[PDB]
Design a protein around this ligand. Structure first.
Ligand SMILES: NC(=O)C1=CN([C@@H]2O[C@H](COP(=O)(O)OP(=O)(O)OC[C@H]3O[C@@H](n4cnc5c(N)ncnc54)[C@H](OP(=O)(O)O)[C@@H]3O)[C@@H](O)[C@H]2O)C=CC1
Ligand SMILES: NC(=O)C1=CN([C@@H]2O[C@H](COP(=O)(O)OP(=O)(O)OC[C@H]3O[C@@H](n4cnc5c(N)ncnc54)[C@H](OP(=O)(O)O)[C@@H]3O)[C@@H](O)[C@H]2O)C=CC1
Ligand SMILES: NC(=O)C1=CN([C@@H]2O[C@H](COP(=O)(O)OP(=O)(O)OC[C@H]3O[C@@H](n4cnc5c(N)ncnc54)[C@H](OP(=O)(O)O)[C@@H]3O)[C@@H](O)[C@H]2O)C=CC1
Ligand SMILES: NC(=O)C1=CN([C@@H]2O[C@H](COP(=O)(O)OP(=O)(O)OC[C@H]3O[C@@H](n4cnc5c(N)ncnc54)[C@H](OP(=O)(O)O)[C@@H]3O)[C@@H](O)[C@H]2O)C=CC1
Lengths: 271, 272, 271, 271
């Protein structure tokens, strides 16, 4: 009942963090617009929600590319058409786009740059501007999903993904102050490693990804808390930030949720 | 129900943030140890909890000075003797101790340096060390209360209070990493302006304080969100951080809750 | 001459910080490539250098748009053609591109987003990629010019300029670590208000600009040090970071030089 | 002669960074006050100064505990007595005080806390307040020496040394803004690993320290620059910060000089 009568758009909800976030919002009694590119996985999210006893009248699934004008327009229009308003936008869609040759570092082509920023930054900007007037009317909120790769530590392998998130953080802070005069609250969450479809999207096989998780989780210099992040761990923070009654006074912040990963220095990997 | 069968110590719970935090914890089913020096205000906190349907056996009221070895031991020891364990420690007690001659800035006397750090930093460190063995056994948690005055912006008026909170943020981060090996979770919250007994404690008349709150709340360059912070605003965050089930993956962080105050540059108080 | 036998590329040297930086480098025995779009102002810079005791053979002038592939290529290649190498690159060109209709905040159009990042971010990335093999050979350095607008405080007016600089800082940190293995040192400077052609490029009249400078310099909550920044103030820091013998151990850092501006909170403008 | 006719007090100049800093200031024609507890090593610095060609009339040696009202009074008294004024104060003295049983982590005793802050924080505060009236007259400067251990990364072993430095950074920022009204410039430098007497002071055998330096320098995740810091590396920065003509616009900042150490994440130590 936390979000009863609230319409929430969750980008990237056809998998990972976005999927679980939409599921929680739904269970919380909210109208949810779930979206992604893979029709099969998007429906899977829809099914998880229906099996919850939640009506399909409270769910709007949209197959679209969030980096295209038409895709963005479809997400916004279908939500208003089915719900008549927008209370919260969660810019969750994102990915570390790899090169065709697994190239990392300064050598990554400018094409990777363009593709990564278009998704991890530009889309966030366009969705924000398009939902803006609707949030002004509903005195709504925005919750962006960033990453500790934004900084303050260097990220020398997937540099464009890193700088796009760094730009995201200042975009979150800046629109938060700008939109605050209209009663809107903009915040963010910067996850550390979380088990989702992220690594698979990068080209990592399921078995290699599992090996990645176990190593990270079992070494304290990697993840101090000793456990791999799970989708719910981030979804919980997103809902908290969207619950004005609870997180009200937090504004323009991106909460780091990384089990302590960003607090450990490279030298500390050695005794 | 969120904190049923959980024992929480809330330092500085005889007023402001600590009072409301203690109240919310009790309403959430927790055994709570409330403490402070003013016996009159501490009892007020207790009454509010009792007149909520909370049994007196779920409350441990302790009058003590958290800056002394004896006061610290009493807080922890009475909690163990009353509830049998400690699940959460919220280091909330703190204050911007004023200069006896009203001096601010670099000129503030060294005596104020000692009193300020002993309260806003040393007490937190000693309570952490003293509750540690019990939190190891319960795989509990710690939530400290810092302030945006810790940085990154400069604080030229009450410098000792500021550096004390700056030191505290690194203590939070460092004990979070050191204690994580025991299944413990240390986090913090850094509030902006919140209406409590803080300004009064500083010697400000309630009339001046109200004018301060109203002015800060009405000027977007001061508090962007447009409203003064309330004790509950910070209490909700502390409970959230104490709720391992919900906030689990957040570790060694001090969430800024200031309505945007710290995001505003001085130059931005003026229009182009 | 502490920069003798050193060849330096100074982007955006037809005006402001870049012009002064080029002057000082040349003044200290360096081969310098100056570049910009306004040939008249670019020639202005060359004459100042020449007016000294510097021979025209130590100065290479390139009229080019640093945002285009061709412009970027002309700058690098003419530098290699005339001097035979590249020891340090200073990514100074940058500008807060205004909306033709004066819009600010979240409302600024996507066209401004594209133009702002293309110059303040993309150009830096491409110049870096393009000079890399030569910096690897000379074990040279890179000095980027950022801005305090990058963060940690919000910038609700010229958001895109702000986020491009925030991304720039993480690009500086990340390339510093990636390129450190090659003996290269990447650093940066984040200026506060500086009297240059910056406000003019934005469209501000000279009278308004001087009025802006005076107000900032005379109000401690704006500029604590009590004086407007000057081109030379930023140039001195660039040279210091480019001077490996002196600043060697500084790596992946962007020194803030703002007379204390970023250290003052909005509330402190009252007290 | 960059600092000719300028009087500089360099605390902790009987070894490491302070020694080298005092030496450079002296070579630059500055009146210097070198202080420490070990008269032997203190005189060693003095000797290095005189052998540089500097007259001992511009050298004031002082043996004193910088943590006592007396020691600091003596440092300041002899400085004014022999020089009549004070232009710059460098708060360099500091150290990581070990537990009687090598105890580390949260368990370090309160005794360690007291000793650590008294030297690393309190002394800086006291020297700052005591030189203040003299810097106001001379529109002088202050340069403190902090450490990357102050944050943003956690320091779980010597917690007290870390929080004292973190407090130092906010003290630097705050006194800089406060003292700026008098034309005084306060800044700082935050070193990464530098080969000095630091480790020995901790109780580490010289052979072990060498093993430590070699290991740190040879591991990219430890020191990306590939070389251990040298006292000269930090001294260079201190003098830069003291040279108002050059570093003028930098105010209330602590320049990180760690060869990139603080930029590497714990996970990045693994492939
Ligand atoms: N996993 C981790 O460790 C971390 C993740 N993050 C952030 O989490 C988000 C990614 O989610 P998880 O984290 O859940 O990742 P996956 O689980 O990788 O989820 C990717 C999600 O975004 C969508 N998406 C990607 N590209 C597009 C596109 N062009 N158009 C529409 N939708 C798109 C996917 O749609 P579908 O596949 O159909 O396309 C899917 O729902 C990003 O913002 C990422 O940076 C931050 C830090 C760490
Ligand atoms: N109010 C604001 O705008 C902000 C407050 N904060 C933080 O909030 C905390 C203060 O609470 P509010 O903020 O609620 O302040 P008051 O409402 O000022 O609460 C002070 C609390 O701490 C206790 N306390 C102070 N000194 C001691 C001492 N020596 N021994 C034991 N208890 C002591 C008080 O006990 P009783 O009076 O008996 O002594 C009381 O419960 C501090 O940690 C402060 O830095 C951070 C940022 C902003
Ligand atoms: N002035 C201030 O207060 C601050 C400035 N900065 C940074 O300083 C830099 C700007 O210099 P000042 O600061 O000296 O500014 P101006 O003095 O504004 O200098 C702009 C410089 O960059 C060049 N430039 C702009 N766009 C292009 C382009 N498409 N192709 C080639 N050159 C281009 C100009 O060339 P010409 O005009 O021919 O085109 C000129 O040399 C930026 O990186 C800016 O963000 C950061 C903070 C504050
Ligand atoms: N070495 C490293 O890797 C790093 C060092 N630092 C900082 O450098 C400083 C220490 O110098 P180095 O770094 O050169 O260390 P040593 O080379 O360890 O120098 C210690 C210096 O400070 C003095 N000192 C220490 N305690 C006292 C005291 N109670 N009274 C008077 N003087 C005292 C010493 O005097 P003498 O022994 O007579 O007493 C000596 O000149 C500290 O500020 C430290 O935090 C920061 C980061 C890294």
């Amino acid at each position: 009942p936390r979000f009863s009568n609230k319409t929430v758009i969750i980008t990237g909800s056809s998998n990972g963090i976005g999927r679980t976030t939409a599921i929680l919002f739904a269970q919380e009694g909210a109208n949810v617009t779930i979206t992604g590119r893979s029709s099969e996985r998007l429906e899977e999210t829809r099914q998880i929600i229906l099996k919850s006893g939640v009506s399909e009248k409270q769910v709007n699934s949209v197959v679209a590319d969030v980096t295209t004008e038409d895709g963005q327009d479809q997400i916004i229009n279908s939500t208003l058409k089915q719900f008549g308003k927008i209370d919260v936008l969660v810019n969750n869609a994102g990915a570390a786009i790899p090169d065709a040759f697994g190239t990392t570092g300064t050598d990554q082509g400018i094409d990777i740059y363009h593709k990564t920023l278009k998704l991890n930054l530009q889309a966030v900007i366009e969705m924000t501007k398009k939902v803006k007037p609707h949030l002004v009317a509903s005195k709504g909120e925005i919750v962006n999903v960033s990453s500790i790769v934004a900084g303050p530590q260097a990220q020398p392998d997937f540099l464009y993904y890193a700088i796009a998130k760094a730009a995201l953080d200042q975009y979150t802070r800046s629109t938060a102050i700008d939109l605050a005069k209209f009663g809107i609250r903009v915040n963010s969450v910067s996850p550390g490693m979380v088990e989702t479809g992220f690594t698979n999207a990068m080209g990592m096989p399921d078995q290699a990804s599992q090996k990645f998780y176990n190593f990270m989780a079992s070494h304290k210099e990697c993840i101090p808390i000793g456990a791999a992040g799970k989708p719910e761990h981030i979804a919980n923070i997103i809902l908290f930030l969207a619950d004005r009654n609870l997180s009200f006074y937090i504004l323009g912040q991106s909460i780091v949720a990384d089990g302590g990963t960003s607090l450990v220095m490279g030298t500390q990997a050695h005794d």
